[PDB]
From a paper:
The [name] rod is formed by more than 1,000 [name] molecules assembled in a right-handed helical manner, with 3.3 molecules per turn. In a process called donor–strand complementation (DSC), the G1 β-strand of PapD inserts a conserved motif of three alternating hydrophobic residues (called the P1 to P3 residues) plus N101 (P4 residue) into four binding pockets in the hydrophobic groove of the pilus subunits (P1 to P4 binding pockets).
However, by investigating a different [name] mutant with the additional mutation T101L, we obtained crystals of a complex containing one PapD molecule and two PapANtd1_G15N_T101L molecules. However, this T101L mutation had the additional unexpected consequence of stabilizing a complex containing a 1:2 molar ratio of PapD and [name]. It clearly shows one [name] molecule bound to PapD through DSC in a complex very similar to PapD/PapANtd1_G15N; however, this time, the Nte of the donor–strand-complemented [name] molecule is bound to the groove of another [name] molecule, and thus this ternary complex crystal structure provides a snapshot of [name] before and after DSE. The core sheet structure of dsePapA is in a closer conformation than that of dscPapA, as the β-strands on each side of the groove of dsePapA are nearer to each other. Also, the “63–74” loop is ordered in dsePapA and not in dscPapA, as this molecule is missing residues 70 to 73 in this region. DsePapA is only visible in the electron density from residue 20, as its Nte is not interacting in the groove of another [name] molecule and is thus disordered. Figure 3B shows the surface of dsePapA bound to the truncated Nte of dscPapA and that of dscPapA bound to the G1 strand of the chaperone: the PapD G1 strand interacts as expected at the P1 to P4 positions in the groove of dscPapA, the Nte of which interacts in the P2 to P5 pockets in the groove of dsePapA. In contrast to what is observed in the PapE/KNte or any other chaperone–subunit complex structures, the side chain of F152 has moved out of the P4 pocket of the DsePapA structure and the P4 pocket can now accommodate the N15 mutation (substituted for wild-type G15 in the PapANtd1_G15N_T101L mutant to prevent higher-order polymerization). F152 in the dsePapA structure is allowed to move away from the groove position because of the T101L mutation. Indeed, as shown in Figure 4B, the T101L mutation and the insertion of N15 induce a rearrangement of the side-chains in the P4–P5 region, leading to T99 moving out of the P5 region, thereby leaving room for F152 to substitute in its place, the new F152 position being stabilized by L101.
Numbering used by the authors:
A (entry chain B): 10 to 69, 74 to 163
B (entry chain C): 20 to 163
C (entry chain A): 1 to 216
Write the structure that this text describes.
Amino acid sequence: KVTFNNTVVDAPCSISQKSADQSIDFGQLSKSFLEAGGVSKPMDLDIELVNCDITAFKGGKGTVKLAFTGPIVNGHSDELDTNGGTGLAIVVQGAGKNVVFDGSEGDANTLKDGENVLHYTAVVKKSSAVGAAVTEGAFSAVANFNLTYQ
Amino acid sequence: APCSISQKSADQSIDFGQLSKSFLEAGGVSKPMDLDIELVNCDITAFKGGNGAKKGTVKLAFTGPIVNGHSDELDTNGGTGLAIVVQGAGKNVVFDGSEGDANTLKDGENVLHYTAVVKKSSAVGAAVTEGAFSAVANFNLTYQ
Amino acid sequence: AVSLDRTRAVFDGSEKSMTLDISNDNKQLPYLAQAWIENENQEKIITGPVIATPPVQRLEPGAKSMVRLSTTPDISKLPQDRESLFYFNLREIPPRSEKANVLQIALQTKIKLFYRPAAIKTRPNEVWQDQLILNKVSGGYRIENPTPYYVTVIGLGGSEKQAEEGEFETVMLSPRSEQTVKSANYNTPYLSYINDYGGRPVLSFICNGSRCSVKK
Protein backbone atom coordinates (compact mmCIF):
# COMPACT_ATOMS: atom_id res chain seq x y z
CA LYS A 1 0.00 0.00 0.00
CA VAL A 2 0.86 3.65 -0.49
CA THR A 3 -0.44 6.33 1.83
CA PHE A 4 -0.59 9.93 0.59
CA ASN A 5 -0.42 12.79 3.07
CA ASN A 6 -0.93 16.52 2.73
CA THR A 7 -2.26 19.51 4.58
CA VAL A 8 -4.35 22.49 3.47
CA VAL A 9 -4.29 25.98 4.96
CA ASP A 10 -5.70 29.41 4.22
CA ALA A 11 -2.87 31.54 2.79
CA PRO A 12 -2.32 35.21 3.74
CA CYS A 13 -2.73 37.79 0.99
CA SER A 14 0.08 38.92 -1.30
CA ILE A 15 -0.02 42.34 -3.01
CA SER A 16 1.17 43.85 -6.28
CA GLN A 17 0.66 46.88 -8.51
CA LYS A 18 0.91 48.00 -12.13
CA SER A 19 4.49 48.98 -11.30
CA ALA A 20 7.07 46.31 -10.41
CA ASP A 21 8.49 48.50 -7.64
CA GLN A 22 5.07 49.14 -6.15
CA SER A 23 5.08 52.88 -6.61
CA ILE A 24 3.03 55.61 -8.24
CA ASP A 25 4.64 58.64 -9.88
CA PHE A 26 3.05 62.05 -9.37
CA GLY A 27 5.03 63.47 -12.28
CA GLN A 28 6.19 67.08 -12.11
CA LEU A 29 4.35 69.66 -10.02
CA SER A 30 4.43 73.46 -9.79
CA LYS A 31 6.00 74.69 -6.57
CA SER A 32 3.97 77.89 -6.89
CA PHE A 33 0.71 76.03 -7.58
CA LEU A 34 1.08 73.74 -4.56
CA GLU A 35 2.28 76.72 -2.52
CA ALA A 36 -0.84 78.69 -3.42
CA GLY A 37 -3.13 75.93 -2.14
CA GLY A 38 -3.41 73.89 -5.29
CA VAL A 39 -3.34 70.10 -5.12
CA SER A 40 -1.98 67.43 -7.47
CA LYS A 41 -4.34 65.35 -9.58
CA PRO A 42 -5.56 62.47 -7.47
CA MET A 43 -3.60 59.39 -8.60
CA ASP A 44 -4.94 55.87 -8.67
CA LEU A 45 -3.29 53.83 -5.95
CA ASP A 46 -4.51 50.30 -6.71
CA ILE A 47 -3.43 47.28 -4.68
CA GLU A 48 -4.10 43.83 -6.12
CA LEU A 49 -4.70 41.10 -3.52
CA VAL A 50 -3.37 37.78 -4.85
CA ASN A 51 -2.66 34.21 -3.75
CA CYS A 52 -5.42 34.37 -1.16
CA ASP A 53 -9.18 34.06 -0.71
CA ILE A 54 -10.43 37.62 -1.14
CA THR A 55 -13.69 36.62 0.54
CA ALA A 56 -12.59 38.60 3.58
CA PHE A 57 -12.09 42.05 2.04
CA LYS A 58 -15.33 41.88 0.06
CA GLY A 59 -18.26 44.23 0.51
CA GLY A 60 -21.97 43.43 0.65
CA LYS A 61 -17.21 41.79 9.52
CA GLY A 62 -13.57 41.03 8.75
CA THR A 63 -10.98 38.61 10.11
CA VAL A 64 -8.14 40.66 8.66
CA LYS A 65 -7.43 44.13 10.07
CA LEU A 66 -6.05 46.57 7.51
CA ALA A 67 -3.97 49.68 8.19
CA PHE A 68 -1.45 52.11 6.73
CA THR A 69 1.65 53.28 8.55
CA GLY A 70 4.24 55.94 7.87
CA PRO A 71 5.66 59.19 9.33
CA ILE A 72 2.96 61.85 9.66
CA VAL A 73 2.79 65.64 9.53
CA ASN A 74 2.71 66.42 13.26
CA GLY A 75 -0.93 66.94 14.16
CA HIS A 76 -2.24 65.46 10.91
CA SER A 77 -2.38 61.66 10.86
CA ASP A 78 -4.04 61.81 7.45
CA GLU A 79 -1.03 63.56 5.95
CA LEU A 80 1.84 61.27 5.02
CA ASP A 81 5.04 63.30 5.46
CA THR A 82 7.53 63.07 2.57
CA ASN A 83 11.27 62.96 1.90
CA GLY A 84 13.22 65.71 0.18
CA GLY A 85 12.43 68.67 2.41
CA THR A 86 10.05 70.03 -0.22
CA GLY A 87 7.43 70.78 2.41
CA LEU A 88 4.90 68.56 0.65
CA ALA A 89 2.68 65.87 2.17
CA ILE A 90 0.67 62.98 0.71
CA VAL A 91 -3.02 62.34 1.32
CA VAL A 92 -4.76 59.04 0.50
CA GLN A 93 -8.49 58.49 0.02
CA GLY A 94 -10.08 55.06 0.18
CA ALA A 95 -13.82 54.70 -0.23
CA GLY A 96 -15.21 58.07 0.77
CA LYS A 97 -12.90 58.03 3.77
CA ASN A 98 -9.36 59.29 4.28
CA VAL A 99 -6.58 56.96 5.32
CA VAL A 100 -4.64 57.70 8.51
CA PHE A 101 -1.02 56.65 9.07
CA ASP A 102 -0.68 57.01 12.84
CA GLY A 103 -1.47 53.33 12.97
CA SER A 104 -5.26 53.50 13.10
CA GLU A 105 -7.53 50.86 11.61
CA GLY A 106 -8.52 51.40 8.01
CA ASP A 107 -11.48 50.05 6.07
CA ALA A 108 -10.75 46.35 5.44
CA ASN A 109 -13.73 45.63 3.18
CA THR A 110 -13.24 48.21 0.42
CA LEU A 111 -13.45 45.53 -2.29
CA LYS A 112 -15.93 46.21 -5.10
CA ASP A 113 -17.81 43.00 -5.97
CA GLY A 114 -16.15 40.99 -8.73
CA GLU A 115 -12.67 42.40 -8.12
CA ASN A 116 -9.51 41.66 -6.14
CA VAL A 117 -8.10 45.19 -6.25
CA LEU A 118 -8.50 47.70 -3.44
CA HIS A 119 -8.86 51.19 -4.94
CA TYR A 120 -7.45 54.39 -3.41
CA THR A 121 -6.40 57.80 -4.71
CA ALA A 122 -3.44 59.85 -3.58
CA VAL A 123 -2.80 63.58 -3.85
CA VAL A 124 0.28 65.66 -3.10
CA LYS A 125 -0.10 69.02 -1.35
CA LYS A 126 1.64 71.58 0.84
CA SER A 127 2.10 70.26 4.37
CA SER A 128 -0.32 71.44 7.05
CA ALA A 129 2.70 72.09 9.29
CA VAL A 130 2.65 75.64 10.64
CA GLY A 131 4.80 77.88 8.47
CA ALA A 132 5.37 75.22 5.84
CA ALA A 133 6.50 76.34 2.40
CA VAL A 134 6.74 74.40 -0.84
CA THR A 135 10.27 74.34 -2.25
CA GLU A 136 11.74 73.05 -5.50
CA GLY A 137 13.07 69.50 -5.48
CA ALA A 138 12.03 65.86 -5.86
CA PHE A 139 10.13 64.18 -3.01
CA SER A 140 9.34 60.56 -2.15
CA ALA A 141 7.64 58.45 0.50
CA VAL A 142 6.93 54.90 1.63
CA ALA A 143 3.79 53.72 3.36
CA ASN A 144 3.40 50.37 5.13
CA PHE A 145 0.28 48.47 4.13
CA ASN A 146 -0.34 46.29 7.18
CA LEU A 147 -2.58 43.20 7.13
CA THR A 148 -3.04 41.64 10.57
CA TYR A 149 -4.86 38.32 10.57
CA GLN A 150 -6.97 37.02 13.40
CA ALA B 1 5.33 -15.49 -7.93
CA PRO B 2 8.25 -14.43 -10.20
CA CYS B 3 9.12 -11.50 -7.94
CA SER B 4 8.27 -10.06 -4.53
CA ILE B 5 7.70 -6.42 -3.51
CA SER B 6 10.57 -4.87 -1.56
CA GLN B 7 9.89 -4.45 2.14
CA LYS B 8 10.16 -0.68 1.65
CA SER B 9 7.84 -0.49 -1.37
CA ALA B 10 5.11 -2.73 0.07
CA ASP B 11 4.22 -0.08 2.64
CA GLN B 12 5.26 3.46 1.73
CA SER B 13 4.23 7.03 2.51
CA ILE B 14 4.26 10.22 0.46
CA ASP B 15 3.99 13.63 2.10
CA PHE B 16 3.12 16.53 -0.20
CA GLY B 17 3.36 18.95 2.72
CA GLN B 18 1.31 22.10 3.40
CA LEU B 19 -0.76 23.48 0.53
CA SER B 20 -2.67 26.70 -0.13
CA LYS B 21 -6.47 26.41 -0.25
CA SER B 22 -6.46 29.22 -2.84
CA PHE B 23 -3.89 27.56 -5.09
CA LEU B 24 -5.88 24.31 -5.12
CA GLU B 25 -9.32 25.89 -5.55
CA ALA B 26 -8.03 27.89 -8.52
CA GLY B 27 -6.87 24.71 -10.25
CA GLY B 28 -3.36 24.62 -8.83
CA VAL B 29 -1.52 21.30 -8.76
CA SER B 30 1.08 20.26 -6.21
CA LYS B 31 4.70 19.42 -6.99
CA PRO B 32 4.96 15.80 -8.15
CA MET B 33 6.35 13.12 -5.85
CA ASP B 34 8.00 9.82 -6.71
CA LEU B 35 6.11 6.58 -6.11
CA ASP B 36 8.34 3.60 -6.84
CA ILE B 37 7.43 -0.09 -6.55
CA GLU B 38 10.58 -2.19 -6.11
CA LEU B 39 10.41 -5.80 -7.23
CA VAL B 40 13.25 -7.87 -5.78
CA ASN B 41 14.59 -11.41 -6.19
CA CYS B 42 12.84 -11.80 -9.50
CA ASP B 43 13.44 -15.12 -11.23
CA ILE B 44 12.20 -14.58 -14.78
CA THR B 45 14.71 -17.16 -16.01
CA ALA B 46 12.86 -19.82 -14.00
CA PHE B 47 9.66 -18.38 -15.51
CA LYS B 48 10.19 -21.02 -18.21
CA GLY B 49 7.40 -23.39 -17.24
CA GLY B 50 5.55 -23.05 -20.52
CA ASN B 51 7.05 -20.42 -22.81
CA GLY B 52 3.56 -19.10 -23.41
CA ALA B 53 4.73 -16.64 -20.75
CA LYS B 54 5.15 -13.52 -22.92
CA LYS B 55 8.57 -12.52 -21.60
CA GLY B 56 8.78 -11.55 -17.96
CA THR B 57 6.12 -8.87 -18.11
CA VAL B 58 4.13 -7.52 -15.18
CA LYS B 59 0.95 -5.48 -14.98
CA LEU B 60 0.25 -3.44 -11.87
CA ALA B 61 -3.23 -2.50 -10.66
CA PHE B 62 -4.28 0.07 -8.06
CA THR B 63 -7.40 0.03 -5.88
CA GLY B 64 -8.95 2.57 -3.54
CA PRO B 65 -11.92 4.92 -3.01
CA ILE B 66 -12.75 6.81 -6.21
CA VAL B 67 -14.26 10.22 -7.01
CA ASN B 68 -17.55 9.76 -8.88
CA GLY B 69 -17.21 9.99 -12.64
CA HIS B 70 -13.41 10.02 -12.35
CA SER B 71 -11.72 6.66 -11.79
CA ASP B 72 -8.30 8.22 -12.27
CA GLU B 73 -8.70 10.20 -9.05
CA LEU B 74 -8.04 8.60 -5.66
CA ASP B 75 -10.46 9.97 -3.08
CA THR B 76 -9.10 11.47 0.12
CA ASN B 77 -10.15 10.16 3.52
CA GLY B 78 -12.09 12.85 5.36
CA GLY B 79 -12.46 16.27 3.77
CA THR B 80 -14.14 16.43 0.36
CA GLY B 81 -12.52 18.44 -2.43
CA LEU B 82 -9.05 16.90 -2.76
CA ALA B 83 -7.90 14.10 -5.04
CA ILE B 84 -4.68 12.19 -5.71
CA VAL B 85 -3.64 11.53 -9.31
CA VAL B 86 -0.91 9.00 -10.11
CA GLN B 87 0.99 8.68 -13.40
CA GLY B 88 3.09 6.11 -15.19
CA ALA B 89 4.65 6.54 -18.65
CA GLY B 90 2.79 9.83 -18.83
CA LYS B 91 -0.42 7.82 -18.57
CA ASN B 92 -2.80 8.25 -15.63
CA VAL B 93 -3.67 5.35 -13.34
CA VAL B 94 -7.21 4.24 -12.46
CA PHE B 95 -8.17 3.05 -8.98
CA ASP B 96 -10.77 0.43 -9.87
CA GLY B 97 -8.39 -2.52 -10.07
CA SER B 98 -7.85 -2.32 -13.84
CA GLU B 99 -4.56 -3.79 -15.03
CA GLY B 100 -2.03 -1.27 -16.25
CA ASP B 101 0.40 -1.66 -19.14
CA ALA B 102 2.87 -4.53 -19.40
CA ASN B 103 6.35 -3.97 -17.98
CA THR B 104 9.36 -6.04 -19.04
CA LEU B 105 11.18 -7.70 -16.13
CA LYS B 106 14.76 -8.92 -15.91
CA ASP B 107 16.16 -11.34 -13.33
CA GLY B 108 17.10 -9.82 -9.99
CA GLU B 109 15.19 -6.60 -9.33
CA ASN B 110 13.17 -4.10 -11.35
CA VAL B 111 11.68 -0.76 -10.39
CA LEU B 112 8.26 0.44 -11.54
CA HIS B 113 8.31 4.24 -11.53
CA TYR B 114 5.29 6.54 -11.05
CA THR B 115 4.68 10.11 -9.88
CA ALA B 116 1.80 11.49 -7.82
CA VAL B 117 0.15 14.87 -7.18
CA VAL B 118 -2.63 16.42 -5.12
CA LYS B 119 -5.29 18.72 -6.56
CA LYS B 120 -8.97 19.60 -6.48
CA SER B 121 -11.11 16.74 -7.79
CA SER B 122 -12.92 17.07 -11.10
CA ALA B 123 -16.22 16.21 -9.42
CA VAL B 124 -18.97 18.82 -9.74
CA GLY B 125 -19.34 21.07 -6.71
CA ALA B 126 -15.90 19.98 -5.48
CA ALA B 127 -14.78 22.48 -2.85
CA VAL B 128 -11.33 22.62 -1.27
CA THR B 129 -11.37 23.01 2.51
CA GLU B 130 -8.51 23.26 4.98
CA GLY B 131 -7.18 20.60 7.34
CA ALA B 132 -5.08 17.42 7.33
CA PHE B 133 -5.76 14.86 4.61
CA SER B 134 -4.67 11.33 3.80
CA ALA B 135 -5.50 8.92 1.01
CA VAL B 136 -4.63 5.24 0.75
CA ALA B 137 -4.30 3.01 -2.29
CA ASN B 138 -3.44 -0.69 -2.53
CA PHE B 139 -1.86 -2.39 -5.50
CA ASN B 140 -1.56 -5.92 -6.83
CA LEU B 141 0.60 -7.56 -9.49
CA THR B 142 -0.14 -10.03 -12.27
CA TYR B 143 2.65 -11.53 -14.37
CA GLN B 144 2.61 -12.45 -18.06
CA ALA C 1 5.62 41.27 -3.45
CA VAL C 2 6.78 39.13 -0.48
CA SER C 3 4.31 36.64 1.05
CA LEU C 4 3.87 34.25 4.01
CA ASP C 5 2.47 30.71 3.79
CA ARG C 6 -0.11 30.79 6.61
CA THR C 7 -2.46 33.06 8.59
CA ARG C 8 -1.39 31.64 11.96
CA ALA C 9 1.56 29.65 13.25
CA VAL C 10 1.55 26.91 15.86
CA PHE C 11 4.93 26.26 17.46
CA ASP C 12 5.21 22.76 18.88
CA GLY C 13 6.81 23.06 22.30
CA SER C 14 8.31 19.61 21.83
CA GLU C 15 10.38 21.19 19.05
CA LYS C 16 13.23 23.66 19.58
CA SER C 17 12.88 25.20 16.13
CA MET C 18 10.54 25.26 13.08
CA THR C 19 10.35 27.10 9.77
CA LEU C 20 7.87 29.25 7.88
CA ASP C 21 7.90 29.58 4.09
CA ILE C 22 8.07 32.97 2.41
CA SER C 23 7.97 33.95 -1.23
CA ASN C 24 8.88 36.80 -3.52
CA ASP C 25 5.89 36.66 -5.82
CA ASN C 26 7.38 39.47 -7.89
CA LYS C 27 9.06 37.99 -10.98
CA GLN C 28 10.81 41.17 -12.10
CA LEU C 29 12.47 42.73 -9.09
CA PRO C 30 14.27 41.69 -5.90
CA TYR C 31 12.66 42.60 -2.60
CA LEU C 32 13.97 42.39 0.93
CA ALA C 33 11.99 40.54 3.59
CA GLN C 34 12.30 41.48 7.27
CA ALA C 35 11.02 39.20 10.01
CA TRP C 36 10.63 39.74 13.74
CA ILE C 37 8.62 38.69 16.76
CA GLU C 38 6.23 40.57 19.02
CA ASN C 39 4.87 39.59 22.43
CA GLU C 40 1.21 39.20 23.29
CA ASN C 41 0.80 42.99 23.45
CA GLN C 42 2.33 43.15 19.99
CA GLU C 43 5.48 44.81 21.27
CA LYS C 44 8.66 43.85 19.41
CA ILE C 45 10.91 41.50 21.39
CA ILE C 46 14.50 40.66 20.47
CA THR C 47 15.79 38.64 23.41
CA GLY C 48 13.54 35.59 23.22
CA PRO C 49 12.03 33.30 24.28
CA VAL C 50 11.16 32.84 20.58
CA ILE C 51 13.48 34.20 17.91
CA ALA C 52 13.08 34.88 14.19
CA THR C 53 15.96 34.52 11.73
CA PRO C 54 17.26 35.90 9.60
CA PRO C 55 16.00 39.35 10.67
CA VAL C 56 16.28 40.41 7.03
CA GLN C 57 17.07 38.70 3.72
CA ARG C 58 17.17 39.47 0.01
CA LEU C 59 14.81 37.59 -2.30
CA GLU C 60 15.59 37.49 -6.02
CA PRO C 61 12.60 37.70 -8.37
CA GLY C 62 10.38 34.65 -7.86
CA ALA C 63 12.63 33.35 -5.08
CA LYS C 64 11.31 31.01 -2.41
CA SER C 65 12.98 31.03 0.99
CA MET C 66 12.01 30.72 4.62
CA VAL C 67 12.21 32.16 8.10
CA ARG C 68 13.30 30.12 11.08
CA LEU C 69 11.60 30.27 14.47
CA SER C 70 13.85 29.14 17.31
CA THR C 71 13.60 29.05 21.10
CA THR C 72 15.94 30.01 23.94
CA PRO C 73 16.38 28.25 27.31
CA ASP C 74 13.87 30.72 28.72
CA ILE C 75 11.15 29.05 26.64
CA SER C 76 10.78 26.59 29.53
CA LYS C 77 9.81 29.49 31.80
CA LEU C 78 6.58 29.84 29.82
CA PRO C 79 3.57 28.03 31.31
CA GLN C 80 3.58 24.39 30.22
CA ASP C 81 -0.14 23.67 30.59
CA ARG C 82 -1.58 26.35 28.32
CA GLU C 83 -0.70 28.24 25.16
CA SER C 84 1.26 31.50 25.10
CA LEU C 85 0.64 34.22 22.52
CA PHE C 86 3.22 35.83 20.22
CA TYR C 87 3.04 37.51 16.82
CA PHE C 88 5.17 36.84 13.77
CA ASN C 89 5.86 39.72 11.35
CA LEU C 90 7.00 39.66 7.74
CA ARG C 91 7.49 43.05 6.06
CA GLU C 92 9.05 43.76 2.67
CA ILE C 93 11.40 46.53 1.58
CA PRO C 94 10.68 47.32 -2.07
CA PRO C 95 13.66 48.37 -4.20
CA ARG C 96 14.36 52.12 -4.20
CA SER C 97 12.36 53.78 -6.99
CA GLU C 98 13.93 55.19 -10.14
CA LYS C 99 11.47 58.05 -10.73
CA ALA C 100 11.35 61.16 -8.56
CA ASN C 101 8.17 62.25 -6.75
CA VAL C 102 6.98 58.75 -5.97
CA LEU C 103 5.03 56.93 -3.26
CA GLN C 104 5.76 53.26 -2.62
CA ILE C 105 3.67 50.62 -0.84
CA ALA C 106 5.29 48.01 1.44
CA LEU C 107 3.32 45.00 2.68
CA GLN C 108 3.56 43.84 6.26
CA THR C 109 1.90 40.55 7.19
CA LYS C 110 1.28 40.03 10.89
CA ILE C 111 0.00 36.72 12.22
CA LYS C 112 -0.69 35.06 15.53
CA LEU C 113 2.07 32.76 16.72
CA PHE C 114 0.81 30.28 19.30
CA TYR C 115 3.42 28.64 21.51
CA ARG C 116 1.92 25.21 22.28
CA PRO C 117 3.77 23.36 25.09
CA ALA C 118 4.49 19.65 24.51
CA ALA C 119 2.12 18.71 27.34
CA ILE C 120 -0.78 19.96 25.24
CA LYS C 121 0.53 18.82 21.86
CA THR C 122 -2.35 18.15 19.50
CA ARG C 123 -3.26 15.65 16.77
CA PRO C 124 -3.75 16.47 13.06
CA ASN C 125 -7.44 17.47 12.94
CA GLU C 126 -8.12 17.65 16.66
CA VAL C 127 -10.92 19.85 17.96
CA TRP C 128 -11.06 21.36 21.44
CA GLN C 129 -13.28 24.31 20.58
CA ASP C 130 -16.25 22.00 21.11
CA GLN C 131 -15.66 22.45 24.86
CA LEU C 132 -16.76 26.08 24.67
CA ILE C 133 -19.62 26.90 27.03
CA LEU C 134 -22.23 29.58 26.35
CA ASN C 135 -23.92 31.34 29.27
CA LYS C 136 -26.81 33.67 28.45
CA VAL C 137 -26.56 37.01 30.24
CA SER C 138 -27.83 40.57 30.24
CA GLY C 139 -26.78 41.82 26.81
CA GLY C 140 -25.70 38.64 25.09
CA TYR C 141 -23.56 35.67 26.02
CA ARG C 142 -20.60 34.94 28.23
CA ILE C 143 -18.31 32.67 26.21
CA GLU C 144 -16.35 30.29 28.45
CA ASN C 145 -13.10 28.74 27.24
CA PRO C 146 -11.80 26.19 29.75
CA THR C 147 -9.41 24.64 27.21
CA PRO C 148 -5.67 25.36 27.42
CA TYR C 149 -5.73 26.92 23.93
CA TYR C 150 -6.55 30.33 22.46
CA VAL C 151 -9.87 30.25 20.64
CA THR C 152 -10.77 32.81 17.98
CA VAL C 153 -14.55 33.30 17.69
CA ILE C 154 -15.80 34.88 14.47
CA GLY C 155 -19.56 34.23 14.64
CA LEU C 156 -22.58 33.64 16.89
CA GLY C 157 -26.17 33.29 15.69
CA GLY C 158 -29.42 31.34 15.68
CA SER C 159 -28.52 29.49 12.50
CA GLU C 160 -25.49 27.89 10.88
CA LYS C 161 -25.82 30.36 8.00
CA GLN C 162 -26.06 33.24 10.45
CA ALA C 163 -23.01 32.12 12.41
CA GLU C 164 -21.00 32.37 9.21
CA GLU C 165 -22.40 35.36 7.30
CA GLY C 166 -23.54 37.07 10.49
CA GLU C 167 -22.18 40.46 11.51
CA PHE C 168 -20.05 39.55 14.52
CA GLU C 169 -17.13 41.24 16.26
CA THR C 170 -14.26 38.72 16.23
CA VAL C 171 -12.86 38.08 19.69
CA MET C 172 -10.12 35.75 20.94
CA LEU C 173 -10.41 34.02 24.30
CA SER C 174 -7.26 33.21 26.23
CA PRO C 175 -6.68 29.74 27.62
CA ARG C 176 -8.87 29.14 30.67
CA SER C 177 -10.76 32.42 30.45
CA GLU C 178 -14.24 33.72 29.69
CA GLN C 179 -15.66 36.80 28.05
CA THR C 180 -19.04 38.44 27.47
CA VAL C 181 -20.16 39.46 24.00
CA LYS C 182 -23.27 41.47 23.16
CA SER C 183 -25.80 39.39 21.25
CA ALA C 184 -29.45 38.64 20.60
CA ASN C 185 -30.81 35.59 22.40
CA TYR C 186 -31.12 32.48 20.20
CA ASN C 187 -32.92 29.17 20.70
CA THR C 188 -30.26 27.10 18.99
CA PRO C 189 -26.99 29.08 19.25
CA TYR C 190 -24.34 28.52 16.55
CA LEU C 191 -20.70 29.58 16.82
CA SER C 192 -17.94 29.91 14.21
CA TYR C 193 -14.19 29.83 14.91
CA ILE C 194 -10.82 29.76 13.15
CA ASN C 195 -8.87 26.51 13.49
CA ASP C 196 -5.12 25.90 13.15
CA TYR C 197 -5.41 25.50 9.36
CA GLY C 198 -7.35 28.73 8.85
CA GLY C 199 -10.65 26.89 8.48
CA ARG C 200 -13.86 28.32 9.93
CA PRO C 201 -15.89 25.42 11.40
CA VAL C 202 -19.38 25.98 12.83
CA LEU C 203 -20.39 24.63 16.26
CA SER C 204 -24.03 23.93 17.16
CA PHE C 205 -25.15 24.38 20.75
CA ILE C 206 -28.10 23.06 22.73
CA CYS C 207 -29.21 25.03 25.76
CA ASN C 208 -30.41 23.81 29.14
CA GLY C 209 -31.71 27.14 30.37
CA SER C 210 -29.04 29.81 30.62
CA ARG C 211 -26.34 27.20 29.85
CA CYS C 212 -25.44 25.95 26.39
CA SER C 213 -22.99 23.16 25.59
CA VAL C 214 -21.95 21.89 22.17
CA LYS C 215 -24.16 19.17 20.69
CA LYS C 216 -22.35 15.88 20.07
